Design a protein around this ligand. Structure first.
Ligand SMILES: Cc1cc(C)c(/C=N/NC(=O)[C@@H](N)Cc2c[nH]c3ccccc23)c(C)c1
Length: 330
């Protein structure tokens, strides 16, 4: 089997991408944020604290003839940004782009943090990291991909995120028309439950490439590119007037700037992020200070190749017995 679904930016800055997912019978379509940095499929629901719902579409398990309470199961997730959500668990039929999993754990939110409440366009998250991170207790549950994997034509999914445009998540096949040149594959460590890999270095604009190992995670659920402070300082030093602002919470730059590109290494290959991808616009409405799309990972504890990096590539998440990651230009 295979599945193919379009993923759409939630706003004009590509702050996140949402993908329609069918849950239950008859189908209830919710727009979920596919998150390769976590392993829970959780949704706004008829159980979510009313004051914490602000415009989201909700899953109502009582209206689904295939929903079953997973008795005694609860879940609770704390994301590294400080966001959180928790609740109880149903199993139900879940389909993405024509690919159907029966008996998928659907984690129904009773509580969500304010960040989720404020994101009216995000109806929940669909985790695509390794199932070892799933938070369901006392019986850990499998991700949608892990449940689908044996049935898929090939045990893979791909992320093809657009810059200021829709893109595609495919399951079970590699669309050879979706990228240019060849796909370069690189090793993955699953020791922390993430799609963790090591970039071979970086360049800023037309500058020379610096060969240096940068360990980090491929995370479709994170907006920006978070890298070591040394690398990030080298990037912003090429933008007149750029500075790190503790009051704003990262690097800002004059909105009048033309940003340089940023290149990252994948083995001997190179992925170029155009300068425009690194512009996140005014820090507040009408400001001439703009927020940067490359930020320091210092204090996060891990480097994060978020959407700013991933949207510059066609990315293969290879879930074979020994997982690997592939990157191609597009
Ligand atoms: C200090 C710091 C700052 C950020 C932005 C992150 C990213 N975290 N990103 C994630 O955890 C995502 N994989 C999922 C996620 C967290 N909060 C969200 C809000 C909306 C949509 C997705 C997420 C971290 C780990 C630490």
């Amino acid at each position: 089997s295979t599945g193919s679904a379009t993923t759409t930016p939630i706003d004009s800055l590509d702050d996140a991408y949402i993908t329609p997912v069918q849950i239950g019978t008859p189908a209830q379509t919710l727009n979920l944020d596919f998150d390769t940095g976590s392993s829970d499929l959780w949704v706004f629901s008829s159980e979510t604290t009313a004051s914490e719902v602000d415009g989201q579409t909700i899953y109502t398990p009582s209206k689904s003839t295939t929903a079953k309470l997973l008795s005694g199961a609860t879940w609770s997730i704390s994301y590294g940004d400080g966001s959180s959500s928790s609740g109880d668990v149903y199993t139900d039929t879940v389909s993405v782009g024509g690919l159907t999993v029966t008996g998928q754990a659907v984690e129904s939110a009773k509580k969500v943090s304010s960040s989720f409440t404020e994101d009216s366009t995000i109806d929940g998250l669909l985790g695509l990291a390794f199932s070892t991170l799933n938070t369901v207790s006392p019986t850990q549950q499998k991700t949608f991909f892990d449940n689908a994997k044996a049935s898929l034509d090939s045990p893979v999914f791909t992320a093809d995120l657009g810059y200021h445009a829709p893109g595609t998540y495919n399951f079970g096949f590699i669309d050879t028309t979706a990228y240019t040149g060849s796909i370069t594959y690189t090793a993955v460590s699953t020791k922390q439950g993430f799609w963790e890999w090591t970039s071979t270095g970086y360049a800023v604009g037309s500058g020379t490439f610096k060969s240096t190992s940068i360990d980090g995670i491929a995370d479709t659920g994170t907006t920006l590119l978070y890298l070591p402070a040394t690398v990030v300082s080298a990037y912003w030093a090429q933008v007149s007037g750029a500075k790190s602002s503790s009051s704003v919470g990262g690097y800002v730059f004059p909105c009048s700037a033309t940003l340089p590109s940023f290149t990252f290494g994948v083995g001997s290959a190179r992925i170029v992020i155009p300068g425009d991808y690194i512009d996140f616009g005014p820090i507040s409405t009408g400001s001439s200070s703009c927020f940067g799309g490359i930020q320091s990972s210092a204090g996060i504890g891990i480097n994060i190749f978020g959407d700013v990096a991933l949207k510059a590539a066609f990315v293969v998440f290879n879930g074979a017995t020994t997982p690997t990651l592939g990157f191609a230009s597009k």
